[PDB]
Design an enzyme around this catalytic site. Structure first.
Site, PDB file in Angstrom:
ATOM      1  N   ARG A  44      18.707 -21.055  25.437  1.00 19.96           N
ATOM      2  CA  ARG A  44      19.015 -21.147  24.038  1.00 19.96           C
ATOM      3  C   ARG A  44      18.954 -19.787  23.296  1.00 19.96           C
ATOM      4  O   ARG A  44      17.842 -19.161  23.276  1.00 19.96           O
ATOM      5  CB  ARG A  44      18.515 -22.065  23.348  1.00 19.96           C
ATOM      6  CG  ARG A  44      18.914 -23.635  23.565  1.00 19.96           C
ATOM      7  CD  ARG A  44      17.850 -24.320  22.547  1.00 19.96           C
ATOM      8  NE  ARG A  44      18.393 -25.782  23.099  1.00 19.96           N
ATOM      9  CZ  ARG A  44      19.570 -26.538  22.657  1.00 19.96           C
ATOM     10  NH1 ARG A  44      20.348 -26.216  21.816  1.00 19.96           N
ATOM     11  NH2 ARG A  44      19.370 -27.727  23.251  1.00 19.96           N
TER      12      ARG A  44
ATOM     13  N   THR B  85      19.820 -17.958  17.103  1.00 19.60           N
ATOM     14  CA  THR B  85      20.881 -18.871  16.887  1.00 19.60           C
ATOM     15  C   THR B  85      20.813 -20.283  17.425  1.00 19.60           C
ATOM     16  O   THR B  85      21.184 -21.353  17.056  1.00 19.60           O
ATOM     17  CB  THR B  85      22.084 -18.247  17.715  1.00 19.60           C
ATOM     18  OG1 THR B  85      22.611 -17.595  16.689  1.00 19.60           O
ATOM     19  CG2 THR B  85      23.012 -19.253  18.181  1.00 19.60           C
TER      20      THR B  85
ATOM     21  N   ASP C 133       5.699 -30.000  28.359  1.00 17.34           N
ATOM     22  CA  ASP C 133       6.708 -29.030  29.125  1.00 17.34           C
ATOM     23  C   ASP C 133       6.755 -29.031  30.627  1.00 17.34           C
ATOM     24  O   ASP C 133       5.855 -28.498  31.408  1.00 17.34           O
ATOM     25  CB  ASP C 133       6.870 -27.502  28.590  1.00 17.34           C
ATOM     26  CG  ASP C 133       7.810 -26.669  28.910  1.00 17.34           C
ATOM     27  OD1 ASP C 133       8.024 -26.556  30.179  1.00 17.34           O
ATOM     28  OD2 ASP C 133       8.693 -26.681  28.111  1.00 17.34           O
TER      29      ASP C 133
ATOM     30  N   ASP D 101       6.527 -25.838  32.561  1.00 20.14           N
ATOM     31  CA  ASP D 101       5.214 -25.353  32.612  1.00 20.14           C
ATOM     32  C   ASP D 101       4.130 -26.051  33.349  1.00 20.14           C
ATOM     33  O   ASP D 101       3.177 -25.066  34.017  1.00 20.14           O
ATOM     34  CB  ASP D 101       4.832 -25.290  31.230  1.00 20.14           C
ATOM     35  CG  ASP D 101       5.440 -24.006  30.600  1.00 20.14           C
ATOM     36  OD1 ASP D 101       6.178 -23.098  31.193  1.00 20.14           O
ATOM     37  OD2 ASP D 101       5.351 -23.774  29.089  1.00 20.14           O
TER      38      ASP D 101
END
Lengths: 224, 224, 224, 224
Positions: D117, D121, D215, D218
């Site tokens: 991403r 934005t 996550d 991770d």
């Protein structure tokens, strides 16, 4: 001292191959020899060491030169192994090595031999065996992690020989041996080859290798 | 006919759990059953199926609720399994299943039992066994890929019970069974639990399950 | 020829470690370089070889002496590896070596770096990276199967250095390398350590190692 | 609660396959969701779970019908899977699932798609991709452990469709999902299939799945 025993074994028995004594190899032996190590760990490191040992042993097999062409279209000169083999484990401790052999030799045939010393006599006796039918034409990786007095392996070898296996086609894969066991194997079957990861100083009245590792079989299967 | 056989077993024996008959399972069974299947392939698929089988059986163990907090600091209400277990294989076919059990339960203790059918009659005789010492206090995953007459497994159960194992703590993990073997185990030990991947039609005069798979042990270990 | 080469490199570059060129190693190399070998075999053999390569690399790490007491109640003088480490894959080819590392170092931290050469300019640029937060404090096993011009690995090392990793703690794990490649890496970072399985003759008119193996990543992941 | 949500999803989205919520599955989910779980344990269990998820997913492929003859020389009615397939992971998280796929499907082709991403934005851009040349002709096992807003997965699907992959041939394999993600996927690509292991309650302010797992990438690779 170890060096001395090691070198002496090495110069005395041309047929033995000792794995290179790397720090990692020693780190592994350290974990497995420690009486403090938990089963899961013992199993983990034992399997790790076994893989290396097996890879080492596989180099004792015969090979042929073979030339291939790379995707760049140039030739490379390699050396293929084309012989028929099988693993034969000594129940139950040797069975611990089967997974290692199967990891690297997909679907390799596995034979099994169960032997037990007579309580009084001490004569190791064959109790059970299931081997490939054409074992006589094969090279055999005989698996047994400890070689102390060498009585069991010698008996295992005797039956293989009776079955028709050629002595010089037997590769004894072992983790830990005692000089005494080594001497017996070679006094009886000078043509076999032996691959081990370590040679200790002696054996005790109860027949354990020292400083050794204790009972490999119960430690590995957790029946201790 | 299979469906009907399957359902009848299911309705008659509340203690048997049949693995969900998914298309993948069937695909694996076809490869494994196929006479034409090469050994490396047989081992690969047999190993794949065994893991699924073991994962299914583990659901028979007892569990407690357990709540934890996620890294998002929110509670999750789950469960945990807290029992002492061990696997016990019936040599040698059952041994093919140990690796599967060892893959999911790191370092699980493994006991082994060798049973021989007598030559005169054919009553099964206990030839050798090495089991965990506190086996009486554990849940037991009893491993035997094929259950034809159930003579062997019934013998194994008898010894386990004699040693102090609670009948209701024995989980018989099996790949293929014959209605008759099933009926026998439950007539003798109604309290054990049995997990299987398939139920075939009958047994031949040779006592092989049909359509069956042939000799599991010879095929898995390559000793045809 | 090849012997000359290996000798020069070994002589000029004290920090390179060539794996023992055993017959098995050569045999694996022959299957992986052969353009006719099928994807499954390529994968199986590459994994096997990568496993031996990582075991070798691990010896580059620092180790402490450790004495333990065996079950025989006697001391054994071993060693222990105490450093904090991590693997760093050069995407995408290096990713193939991750499983090997995770196989011997359970749960070892794995960093990833994607470096790509500009389609026009050819300059290697850092596209994406995800590394452990404390990488500066660790020993790095930098993984990349091939080292042709060394453009990629040099950039990778550059980014690690900018993050604070010590040059002396980078162990570059490689399958195949070209002399030019080795030379550049040592010109730019004379302090890293490099472990490799083979050194080829030279590079293609198109910068491909020869005789080589072709595009390792395409062959390993099956995108060729 | 969870049952309500599950019922709705199951009812509204006929293309989602929730895996059987067994006590084992739950215990595994409880360890991997626990914030206190150590990395080694995290990795062992996720891997175990991924294996079951992949087996579940494989049932989505088309299969024929196949008869084989058993060693008992009787025929057996089975099935075989005849489609060309490949796995596509969404870097990095999706990569954790490749081992599982390769474990059950030897040498299966693996494509990779890195979507990121824009940092200002917030939108998904395709950063890197490496796919099999004939992906247009195969079934795609799309791998990504989490599905929160479904932004990344929707972009991955857009790219595959641009390459000619048929929507109805994509099987999105996921571990954890939020209802909104599921809803979005189906709003945009009603014909894909999705196999998942858990459906959570909602996303939190930081668009984190809750109760969730933190996550995944991770915790799995250790770049926590």
């Amino acid at each position: 001292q170890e060096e001395s025993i090691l070198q002496d074994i090495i110069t005395r028995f041309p047929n033995v191959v000792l794995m290179k004594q790397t720090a990692q190899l020693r780190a592994m032996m350290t974990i497995i020899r420690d009486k403090e190590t938990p089963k899961e760990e013992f199993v983990f490191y034992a399997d790790r060491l076994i893989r290396l040992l097996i890879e080492e042993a596989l180099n004792e097999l015969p090979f042929q030169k073979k030339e291939v062409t790379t995707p760049l279209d140039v030739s490379y000169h390699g050396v293929s192994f084309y012989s028929k083999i099988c693993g034969v484990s000594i129940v139950r401790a040797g069975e611990s090595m089967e997974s290692g052999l199967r990891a690297v030799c997909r679907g390799v045939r596995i034979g099994k031999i169960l032997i037990q010393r007579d309580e009084t006599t001490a004569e190791p006796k064959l109790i059970y065996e299931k081997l490939p039918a054409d074992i006589r034409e094969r090279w055999v990786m005989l698996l047994d992690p400890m070689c102390a007095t060498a009585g069991s392996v010698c008996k295992a070898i005797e039956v293989l020989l009776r079955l028709g296996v050629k002595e010089e086609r037997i590769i004894f894969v072992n983790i830990l041996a005692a000089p005494q066991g080594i001497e017996r194997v070679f006094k009886e079957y000078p043509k076999v080859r032996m691959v081990t990861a370590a040679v200790d100083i002696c054996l005790n009245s109860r027949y354990y290798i020292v400083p050794g590792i204790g009972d490999f079989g119960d430690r590995y299967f957790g029946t201790m």
